[PDB]
Tab-separated table of N, CA and C in Angstrom:
chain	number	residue	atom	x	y	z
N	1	UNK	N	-13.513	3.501	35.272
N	1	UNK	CA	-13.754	3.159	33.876
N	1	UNK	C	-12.724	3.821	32.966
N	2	UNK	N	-11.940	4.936	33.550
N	2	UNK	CA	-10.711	5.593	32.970
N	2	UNK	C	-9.896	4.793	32.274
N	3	UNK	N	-9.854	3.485	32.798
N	3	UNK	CA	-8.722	2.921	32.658
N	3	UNK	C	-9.184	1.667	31.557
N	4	UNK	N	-10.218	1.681	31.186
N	4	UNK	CA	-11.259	0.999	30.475
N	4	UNK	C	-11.090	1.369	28.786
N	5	UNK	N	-10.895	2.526	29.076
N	5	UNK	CA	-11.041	3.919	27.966
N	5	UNK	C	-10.035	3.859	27.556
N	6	UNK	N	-8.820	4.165	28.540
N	6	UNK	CA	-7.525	4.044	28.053
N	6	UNK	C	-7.124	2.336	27.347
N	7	UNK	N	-7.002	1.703	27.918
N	7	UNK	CA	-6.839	-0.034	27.481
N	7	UNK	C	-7.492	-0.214	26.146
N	8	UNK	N	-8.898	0.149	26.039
N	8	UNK	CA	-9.277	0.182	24.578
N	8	UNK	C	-8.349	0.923	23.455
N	9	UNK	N	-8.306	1.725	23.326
N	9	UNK	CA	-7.272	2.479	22.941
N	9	UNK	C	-6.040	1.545	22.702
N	10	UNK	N	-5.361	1.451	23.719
N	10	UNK	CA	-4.135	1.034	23.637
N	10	UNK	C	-4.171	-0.211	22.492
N	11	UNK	N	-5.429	-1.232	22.768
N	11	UNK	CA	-5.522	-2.369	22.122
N	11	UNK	C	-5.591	-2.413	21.360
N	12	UNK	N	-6.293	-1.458	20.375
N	12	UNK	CA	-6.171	-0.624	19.153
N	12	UNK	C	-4.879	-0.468	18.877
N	13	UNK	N	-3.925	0.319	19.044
N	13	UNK	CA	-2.465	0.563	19.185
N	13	UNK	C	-1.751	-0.504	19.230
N	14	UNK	N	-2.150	-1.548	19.472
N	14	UNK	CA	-1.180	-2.787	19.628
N	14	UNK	C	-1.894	-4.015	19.100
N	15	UNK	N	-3.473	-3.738	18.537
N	15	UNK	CA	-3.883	-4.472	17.248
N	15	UNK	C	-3.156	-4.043	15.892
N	16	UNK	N	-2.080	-5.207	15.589
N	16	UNK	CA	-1.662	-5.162	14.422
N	16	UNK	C	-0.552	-4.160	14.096
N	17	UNK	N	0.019	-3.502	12.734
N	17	UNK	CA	0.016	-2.695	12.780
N	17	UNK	C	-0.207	-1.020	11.736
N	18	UNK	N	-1.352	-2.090	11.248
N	18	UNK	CA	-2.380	-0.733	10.620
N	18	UNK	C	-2.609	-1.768	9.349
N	19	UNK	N	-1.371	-2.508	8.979
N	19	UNK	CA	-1.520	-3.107	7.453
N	19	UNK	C	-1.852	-4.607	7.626
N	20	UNK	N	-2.683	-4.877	6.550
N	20	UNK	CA	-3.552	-6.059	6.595
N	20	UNK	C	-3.099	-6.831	5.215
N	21	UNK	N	-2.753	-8.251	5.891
N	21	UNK	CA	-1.800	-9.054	5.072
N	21	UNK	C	-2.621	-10.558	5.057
N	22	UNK	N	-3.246	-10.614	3.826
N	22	UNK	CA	-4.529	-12.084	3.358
N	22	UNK	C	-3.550	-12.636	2.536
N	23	UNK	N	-4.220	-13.963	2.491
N	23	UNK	CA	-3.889	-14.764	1.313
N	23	UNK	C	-5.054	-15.068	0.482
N	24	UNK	N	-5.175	-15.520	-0.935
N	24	UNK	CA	-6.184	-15.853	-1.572
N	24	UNK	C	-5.500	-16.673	-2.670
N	25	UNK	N	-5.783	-18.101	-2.428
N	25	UNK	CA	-4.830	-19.198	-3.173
N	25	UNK	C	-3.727	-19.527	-2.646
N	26	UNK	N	-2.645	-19.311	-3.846
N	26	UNK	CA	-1.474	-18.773	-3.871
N	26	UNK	C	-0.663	-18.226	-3.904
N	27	UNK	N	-1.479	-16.808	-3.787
N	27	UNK	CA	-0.911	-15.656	-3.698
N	27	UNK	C	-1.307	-15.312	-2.934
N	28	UNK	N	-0.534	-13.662	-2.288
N	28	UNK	CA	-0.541	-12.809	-1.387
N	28	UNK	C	-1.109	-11.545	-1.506
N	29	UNK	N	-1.968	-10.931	-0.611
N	29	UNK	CA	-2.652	-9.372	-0.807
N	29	UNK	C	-2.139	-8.655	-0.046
N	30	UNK	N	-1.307	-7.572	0.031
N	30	UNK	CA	-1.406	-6.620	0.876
N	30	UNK	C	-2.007	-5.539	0.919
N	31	UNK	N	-3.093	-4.831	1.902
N	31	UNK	CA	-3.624	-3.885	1.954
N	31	UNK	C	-3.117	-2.975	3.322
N	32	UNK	N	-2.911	-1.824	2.773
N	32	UNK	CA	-2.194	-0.790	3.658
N	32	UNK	C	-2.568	0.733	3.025
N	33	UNK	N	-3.073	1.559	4.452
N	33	UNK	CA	-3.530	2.778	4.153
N	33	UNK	C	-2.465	3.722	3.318
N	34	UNK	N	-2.796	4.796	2.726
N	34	UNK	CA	-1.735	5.731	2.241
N	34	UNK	C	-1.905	6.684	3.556
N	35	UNK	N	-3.108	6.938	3.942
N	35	UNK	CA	-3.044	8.103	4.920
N	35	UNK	C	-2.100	7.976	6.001
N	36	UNK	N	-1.646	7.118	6.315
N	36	UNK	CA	-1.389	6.775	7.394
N	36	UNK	C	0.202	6.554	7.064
N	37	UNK	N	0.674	6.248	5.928
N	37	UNK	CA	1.804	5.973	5.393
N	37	UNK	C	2.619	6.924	4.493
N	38	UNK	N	1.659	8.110	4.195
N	38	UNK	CA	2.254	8.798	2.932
N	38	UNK	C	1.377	10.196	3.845
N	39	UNK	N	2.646	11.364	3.629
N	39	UNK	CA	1.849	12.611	4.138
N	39	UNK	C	0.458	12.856	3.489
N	40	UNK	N	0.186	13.484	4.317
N	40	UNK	CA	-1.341	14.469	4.301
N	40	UNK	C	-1.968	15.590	2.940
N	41	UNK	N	-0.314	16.121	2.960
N	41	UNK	CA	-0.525	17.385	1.957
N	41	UNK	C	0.412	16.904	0.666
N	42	UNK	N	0.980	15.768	0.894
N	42	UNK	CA	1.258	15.261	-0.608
N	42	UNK	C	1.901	13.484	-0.492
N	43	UNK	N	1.795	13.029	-1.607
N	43	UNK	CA	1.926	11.914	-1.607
N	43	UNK	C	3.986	11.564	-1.582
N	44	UNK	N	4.202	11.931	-0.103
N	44	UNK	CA	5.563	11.634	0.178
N	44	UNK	C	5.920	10.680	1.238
N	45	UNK	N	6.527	9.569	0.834
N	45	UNK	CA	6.271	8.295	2.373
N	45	UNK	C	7.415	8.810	3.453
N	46	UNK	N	6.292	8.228	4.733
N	46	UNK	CA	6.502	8.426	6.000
N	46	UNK	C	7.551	7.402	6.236
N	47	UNK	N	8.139	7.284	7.170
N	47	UNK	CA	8.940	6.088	7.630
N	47	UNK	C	8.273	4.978	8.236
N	48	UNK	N	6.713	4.980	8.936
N	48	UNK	CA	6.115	3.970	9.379
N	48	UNK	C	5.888	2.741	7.402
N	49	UNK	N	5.494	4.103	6.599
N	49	UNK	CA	5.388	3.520	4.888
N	49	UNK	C	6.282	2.530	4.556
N	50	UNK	N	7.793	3.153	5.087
N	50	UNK	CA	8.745	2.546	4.437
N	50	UNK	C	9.412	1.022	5.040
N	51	UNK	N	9.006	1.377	6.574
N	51	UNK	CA	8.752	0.013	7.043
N	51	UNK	C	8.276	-1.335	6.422
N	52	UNK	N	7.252	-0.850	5.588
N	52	UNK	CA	6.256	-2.016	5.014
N	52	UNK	C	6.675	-2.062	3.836
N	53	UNK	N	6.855	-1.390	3.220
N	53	UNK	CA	7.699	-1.413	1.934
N	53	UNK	C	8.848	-2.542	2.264
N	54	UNK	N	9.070	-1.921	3.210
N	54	UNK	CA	10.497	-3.028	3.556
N	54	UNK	C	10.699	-4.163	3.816
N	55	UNK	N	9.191	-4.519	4.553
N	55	UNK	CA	8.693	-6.213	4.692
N	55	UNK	C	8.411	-6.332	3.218
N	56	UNK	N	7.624	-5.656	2.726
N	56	UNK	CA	7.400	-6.523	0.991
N	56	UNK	C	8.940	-6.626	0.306
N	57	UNK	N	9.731	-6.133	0.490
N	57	UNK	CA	11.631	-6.186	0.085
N	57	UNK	C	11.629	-7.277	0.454
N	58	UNK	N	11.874	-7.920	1.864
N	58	UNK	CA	11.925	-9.124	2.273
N	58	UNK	C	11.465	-10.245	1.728
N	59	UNK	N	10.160	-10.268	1.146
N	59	UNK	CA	9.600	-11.557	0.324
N	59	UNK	C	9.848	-11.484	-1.075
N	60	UNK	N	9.798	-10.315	-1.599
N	60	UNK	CA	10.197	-10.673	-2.949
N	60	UNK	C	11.365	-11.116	-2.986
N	61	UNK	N	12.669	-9.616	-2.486
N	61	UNK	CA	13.769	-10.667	-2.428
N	61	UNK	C	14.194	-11.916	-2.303
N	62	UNK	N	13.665	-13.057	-1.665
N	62	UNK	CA	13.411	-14.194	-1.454
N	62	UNK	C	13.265	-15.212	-2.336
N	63	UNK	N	11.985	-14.248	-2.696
N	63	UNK	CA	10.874	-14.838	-3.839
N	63	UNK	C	11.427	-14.180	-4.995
N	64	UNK	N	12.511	-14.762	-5.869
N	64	UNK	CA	12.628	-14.295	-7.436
N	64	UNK	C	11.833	-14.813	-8.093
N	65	UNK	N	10.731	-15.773	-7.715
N	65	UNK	CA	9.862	-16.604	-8.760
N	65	UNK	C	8.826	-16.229	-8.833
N	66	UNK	N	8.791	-14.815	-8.132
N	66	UNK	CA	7.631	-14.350	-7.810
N	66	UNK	C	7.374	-13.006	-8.472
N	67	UNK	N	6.436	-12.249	-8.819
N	67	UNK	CA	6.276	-10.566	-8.867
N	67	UNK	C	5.372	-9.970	-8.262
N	68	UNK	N	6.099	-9.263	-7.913
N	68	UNK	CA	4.717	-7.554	-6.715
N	68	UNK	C	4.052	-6.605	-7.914
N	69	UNK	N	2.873	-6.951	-7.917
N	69	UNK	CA	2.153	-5.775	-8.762
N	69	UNK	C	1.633	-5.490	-7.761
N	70	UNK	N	1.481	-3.612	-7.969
N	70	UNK	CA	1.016	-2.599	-6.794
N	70	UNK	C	0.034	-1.409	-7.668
N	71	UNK	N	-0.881	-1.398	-7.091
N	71	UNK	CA	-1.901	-0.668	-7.837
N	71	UNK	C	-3.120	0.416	-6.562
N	72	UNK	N	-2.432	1.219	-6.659
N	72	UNK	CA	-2.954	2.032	-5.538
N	72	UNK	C	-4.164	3.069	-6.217
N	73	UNK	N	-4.741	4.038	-5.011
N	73	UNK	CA	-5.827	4.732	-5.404
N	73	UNK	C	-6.848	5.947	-4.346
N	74	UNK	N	-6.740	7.020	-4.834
N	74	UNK	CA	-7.095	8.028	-3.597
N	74	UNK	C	-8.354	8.906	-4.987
N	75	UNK	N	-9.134	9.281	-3.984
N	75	UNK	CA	-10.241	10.048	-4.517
N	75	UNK	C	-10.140	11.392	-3.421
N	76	UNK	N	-10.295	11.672	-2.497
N	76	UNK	CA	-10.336	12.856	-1.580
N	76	UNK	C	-9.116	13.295	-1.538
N	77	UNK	N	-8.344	12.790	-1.777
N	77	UNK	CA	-6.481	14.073	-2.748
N	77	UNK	C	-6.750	14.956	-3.398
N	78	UNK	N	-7.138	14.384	-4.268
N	78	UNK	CA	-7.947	15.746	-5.987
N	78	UNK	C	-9.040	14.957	-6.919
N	79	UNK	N	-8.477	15.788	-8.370
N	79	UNK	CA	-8.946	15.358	-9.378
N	79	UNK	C	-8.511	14.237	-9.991
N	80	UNK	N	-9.255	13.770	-10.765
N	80	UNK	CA	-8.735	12.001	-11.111
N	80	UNK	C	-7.710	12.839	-12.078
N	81	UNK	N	-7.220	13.399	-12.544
N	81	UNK	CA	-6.003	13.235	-13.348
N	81	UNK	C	-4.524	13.625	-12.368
N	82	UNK	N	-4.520	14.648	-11.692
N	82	UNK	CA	-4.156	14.267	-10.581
N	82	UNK	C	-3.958	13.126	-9.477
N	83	UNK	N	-5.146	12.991	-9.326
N	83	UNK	CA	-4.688	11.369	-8.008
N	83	UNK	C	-3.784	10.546	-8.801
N	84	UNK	N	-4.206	10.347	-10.343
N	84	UNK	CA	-3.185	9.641	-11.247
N	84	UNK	C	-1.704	9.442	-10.735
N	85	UNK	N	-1.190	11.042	-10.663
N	85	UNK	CA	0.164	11.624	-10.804
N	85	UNK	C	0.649	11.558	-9.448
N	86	UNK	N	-0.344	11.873	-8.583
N	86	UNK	CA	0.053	11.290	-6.723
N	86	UNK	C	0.306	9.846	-6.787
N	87	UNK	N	-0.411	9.155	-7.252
N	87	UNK	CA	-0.354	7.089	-7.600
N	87	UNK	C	0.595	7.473	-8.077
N	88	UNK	N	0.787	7.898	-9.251
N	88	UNK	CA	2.201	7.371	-9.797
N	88	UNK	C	3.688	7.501	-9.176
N	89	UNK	N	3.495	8.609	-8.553
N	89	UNK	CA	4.585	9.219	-7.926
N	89	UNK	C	4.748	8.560	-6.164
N	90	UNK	N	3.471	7.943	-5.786
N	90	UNK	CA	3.574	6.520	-4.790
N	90	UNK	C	4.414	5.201	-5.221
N	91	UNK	N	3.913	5.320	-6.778
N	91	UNK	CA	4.073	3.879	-7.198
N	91	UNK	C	5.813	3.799	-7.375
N	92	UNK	N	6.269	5.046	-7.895
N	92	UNK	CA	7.964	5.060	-8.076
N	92	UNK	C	8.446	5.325	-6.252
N	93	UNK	N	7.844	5.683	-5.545
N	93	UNK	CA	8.291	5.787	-4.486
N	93	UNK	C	8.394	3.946	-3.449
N	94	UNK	N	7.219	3.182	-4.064
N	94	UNK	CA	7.462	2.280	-3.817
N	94	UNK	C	8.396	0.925	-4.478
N	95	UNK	N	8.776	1.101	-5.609
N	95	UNK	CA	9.776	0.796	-6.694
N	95	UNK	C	11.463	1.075	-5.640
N	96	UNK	N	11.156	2.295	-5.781
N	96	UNK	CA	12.551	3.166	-5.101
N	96	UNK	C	13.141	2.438	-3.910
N	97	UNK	N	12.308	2.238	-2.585
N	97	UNK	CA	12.127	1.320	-2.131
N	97	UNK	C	12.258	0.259	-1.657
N	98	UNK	N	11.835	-0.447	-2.512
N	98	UNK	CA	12.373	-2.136	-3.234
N	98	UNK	C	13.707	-2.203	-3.544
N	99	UNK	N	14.408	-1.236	-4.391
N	99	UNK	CA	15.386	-1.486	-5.431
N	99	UNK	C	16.283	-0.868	-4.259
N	100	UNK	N	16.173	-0.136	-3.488
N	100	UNK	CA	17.363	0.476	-2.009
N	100	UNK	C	17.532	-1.470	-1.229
N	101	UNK	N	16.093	-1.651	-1.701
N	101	UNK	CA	16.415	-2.795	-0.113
N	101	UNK	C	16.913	-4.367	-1.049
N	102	UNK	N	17.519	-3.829	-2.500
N	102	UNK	CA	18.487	-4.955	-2.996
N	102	UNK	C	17.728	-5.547	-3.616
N	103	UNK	N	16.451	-5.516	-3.879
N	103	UNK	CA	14.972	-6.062	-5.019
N	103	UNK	C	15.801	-5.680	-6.306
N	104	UNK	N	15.289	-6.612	-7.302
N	104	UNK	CA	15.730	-6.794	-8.762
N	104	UNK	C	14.719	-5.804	-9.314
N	105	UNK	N	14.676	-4.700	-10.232
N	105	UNK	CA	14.095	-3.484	-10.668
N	105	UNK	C	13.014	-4.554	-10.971
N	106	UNK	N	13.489	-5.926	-11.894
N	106	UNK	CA	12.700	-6.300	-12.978
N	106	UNK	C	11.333	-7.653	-12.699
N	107	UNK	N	11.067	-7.813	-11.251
N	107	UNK	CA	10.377	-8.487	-10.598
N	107	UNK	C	9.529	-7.082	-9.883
N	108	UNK	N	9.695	-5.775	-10.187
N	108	UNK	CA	8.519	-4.970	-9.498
N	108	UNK	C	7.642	-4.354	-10.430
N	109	UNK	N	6.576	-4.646	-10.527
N	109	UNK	CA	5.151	-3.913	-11.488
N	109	UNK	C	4.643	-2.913	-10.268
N	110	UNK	N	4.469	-1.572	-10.626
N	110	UNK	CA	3.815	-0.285	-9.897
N	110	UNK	C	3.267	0.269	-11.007
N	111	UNK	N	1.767	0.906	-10.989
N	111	UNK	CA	1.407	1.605	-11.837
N	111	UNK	C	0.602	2.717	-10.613
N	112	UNK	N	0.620	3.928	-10.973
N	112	UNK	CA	-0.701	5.002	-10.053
N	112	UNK	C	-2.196	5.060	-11.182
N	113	UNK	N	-3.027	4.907	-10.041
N	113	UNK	CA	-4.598	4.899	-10.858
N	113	UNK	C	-5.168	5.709	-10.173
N	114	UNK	N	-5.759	6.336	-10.113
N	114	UNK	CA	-6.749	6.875	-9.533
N	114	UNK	C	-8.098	6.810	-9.282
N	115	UNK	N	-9.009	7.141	-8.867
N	115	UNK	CA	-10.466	6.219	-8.470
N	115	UNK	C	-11.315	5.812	-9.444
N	116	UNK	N	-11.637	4.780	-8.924
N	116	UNK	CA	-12.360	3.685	-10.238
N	116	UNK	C	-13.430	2.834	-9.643
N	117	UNK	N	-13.199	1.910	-8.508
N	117	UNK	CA	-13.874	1.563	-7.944
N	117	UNK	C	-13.677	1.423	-6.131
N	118	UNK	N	-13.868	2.648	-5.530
N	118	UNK	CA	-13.886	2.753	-4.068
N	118	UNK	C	-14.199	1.757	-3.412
N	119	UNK	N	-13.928	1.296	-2.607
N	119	UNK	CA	-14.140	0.750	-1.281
N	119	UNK	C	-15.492	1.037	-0.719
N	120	UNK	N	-15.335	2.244	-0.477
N	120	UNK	CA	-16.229	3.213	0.554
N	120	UNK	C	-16.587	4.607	0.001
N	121	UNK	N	-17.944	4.979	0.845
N	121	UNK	CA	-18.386	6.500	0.610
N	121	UNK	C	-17.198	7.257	0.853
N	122	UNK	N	-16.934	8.532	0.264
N	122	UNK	CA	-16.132	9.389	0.209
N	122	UNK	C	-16.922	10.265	1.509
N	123	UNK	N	-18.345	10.121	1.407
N	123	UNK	CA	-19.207	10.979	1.881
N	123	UNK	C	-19.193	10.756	3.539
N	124	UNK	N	-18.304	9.762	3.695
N	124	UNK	CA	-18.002	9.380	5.628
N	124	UNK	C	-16.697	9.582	5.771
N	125	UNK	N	-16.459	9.818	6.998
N	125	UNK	CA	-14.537	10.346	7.097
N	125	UNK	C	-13.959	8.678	7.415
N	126	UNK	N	-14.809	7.626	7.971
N	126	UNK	CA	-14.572	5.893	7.669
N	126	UNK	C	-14.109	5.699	6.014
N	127	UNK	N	-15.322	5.868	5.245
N	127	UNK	CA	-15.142	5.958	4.027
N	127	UNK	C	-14.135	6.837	3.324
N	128	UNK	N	-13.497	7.563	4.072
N	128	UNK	CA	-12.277	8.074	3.070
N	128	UNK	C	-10.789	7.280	3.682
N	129	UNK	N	-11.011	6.755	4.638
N	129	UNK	CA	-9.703	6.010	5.612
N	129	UNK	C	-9.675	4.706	4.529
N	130	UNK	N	-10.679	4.312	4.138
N	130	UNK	CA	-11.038	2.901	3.330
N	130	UNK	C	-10.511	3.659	2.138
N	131	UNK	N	-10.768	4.100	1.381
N	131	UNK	CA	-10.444	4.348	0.309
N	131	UNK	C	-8.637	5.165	0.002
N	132	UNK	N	-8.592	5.283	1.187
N	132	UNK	CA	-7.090	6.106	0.785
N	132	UNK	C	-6.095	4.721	1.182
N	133	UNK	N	-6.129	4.043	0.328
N	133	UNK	CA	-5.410	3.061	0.511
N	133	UNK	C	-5.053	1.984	-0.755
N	134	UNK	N	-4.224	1.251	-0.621
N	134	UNK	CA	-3.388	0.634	-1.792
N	134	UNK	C	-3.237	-0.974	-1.735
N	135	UNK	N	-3.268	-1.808	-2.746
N	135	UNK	CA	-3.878	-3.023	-3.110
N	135	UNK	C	-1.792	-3.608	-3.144
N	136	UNK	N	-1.282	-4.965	-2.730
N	136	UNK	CA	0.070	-5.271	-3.375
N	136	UNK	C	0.240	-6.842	-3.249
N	137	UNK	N	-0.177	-7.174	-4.714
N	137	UNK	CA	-0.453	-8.248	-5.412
N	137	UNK	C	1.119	-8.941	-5.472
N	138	UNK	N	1.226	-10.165	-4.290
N	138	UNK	CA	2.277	-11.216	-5.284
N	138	UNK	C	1.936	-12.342	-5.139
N	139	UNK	N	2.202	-12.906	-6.653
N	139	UNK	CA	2.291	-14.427	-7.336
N	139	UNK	C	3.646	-14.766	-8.004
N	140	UNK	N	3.287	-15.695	-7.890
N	140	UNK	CA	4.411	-16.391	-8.880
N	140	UNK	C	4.453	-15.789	-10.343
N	141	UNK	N	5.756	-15.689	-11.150
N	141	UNK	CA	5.931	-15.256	-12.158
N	141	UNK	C	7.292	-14.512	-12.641
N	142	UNK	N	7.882	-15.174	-13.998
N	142	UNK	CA	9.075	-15.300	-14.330
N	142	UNK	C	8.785	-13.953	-15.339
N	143	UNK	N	8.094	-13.541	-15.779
N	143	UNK	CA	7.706	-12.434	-16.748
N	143	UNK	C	8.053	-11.032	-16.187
N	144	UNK	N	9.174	-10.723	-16.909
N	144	UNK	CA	9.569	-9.388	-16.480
N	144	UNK	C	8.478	-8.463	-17.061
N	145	UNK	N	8.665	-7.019	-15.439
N	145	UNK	CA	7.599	-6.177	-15.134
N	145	UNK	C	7.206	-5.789	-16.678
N	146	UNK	N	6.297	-4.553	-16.435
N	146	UNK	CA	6.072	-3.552	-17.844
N	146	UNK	C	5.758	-2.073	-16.854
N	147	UNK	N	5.622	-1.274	-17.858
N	147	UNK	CA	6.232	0.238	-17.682
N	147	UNK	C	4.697	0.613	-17.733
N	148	UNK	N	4.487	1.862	-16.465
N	148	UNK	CA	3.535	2.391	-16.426
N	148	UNK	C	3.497	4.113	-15.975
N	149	UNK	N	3.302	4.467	-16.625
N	149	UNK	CA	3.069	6.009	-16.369
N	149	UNK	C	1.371	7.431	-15.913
């Protein structure tokens, strides 16, 4: 059954790869953990992060008719004025990003928020995997970004 144990596992490991990519309409959702993408002890991206960052480069670039609004959100980081300043400092990290991988500054909307409406209990270590994670909205749209701090 060792080998039962192990294979599960693995399938896990080779389900997907962590980030979950819907459609709804005509537009696109991406949902992707921070934990898993952005260190532990501060909000600085990993290279698995920047990977995906790098697939969203790919479609916008593409897509000039389009814009990425990104609106992320952590509660078990800190205090909400804080998680703010971790979001925000995600949100220019994901900007940064974009604009390395040849993205037009003015087709990317990022703002950092901090918790508002969770996912999940904070009060389960499930419920904090759900919640440490980030929303990346594209539709169509000729309307250059706006500024968020």
């Amino acid at each position: 059954y060792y080998m039962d144990v192990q294979e599960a596992k693995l399938r896990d490991k080779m389900r997907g790869t962590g980030v979950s990519v819907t459609r709804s309409g005509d537009n696109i959702i991406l949902n992707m953990p921070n934990n898993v993408t952005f260190d532990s002890s501060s909000a600085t991206l990993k290279p698995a992060g920047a990977n995906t960052l790098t697939g969203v480069a790919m479609v916008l670039k593409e897509y000039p008719k389009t814009a990425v609004n990104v609106i992320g959100y952590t509660d078990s980081t800190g205090g909400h004025d804080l998680n703010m300043r971790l979001s925000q400092q995600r949100a220019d990290s994901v900007a940064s990003a974009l604009i390395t991988q040849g993205v037009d500054a003015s087709r990317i909307r990022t703002q950092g928020l901090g918790p508002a409406n969770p996912i999940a209990s904070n009060s389960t270590a499930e419920g904090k995997a759900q919640n440490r994670r980030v929303e990346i909205t594209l539709s169509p749209l000729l309307e250059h970004h706006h500024h968020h701090h």
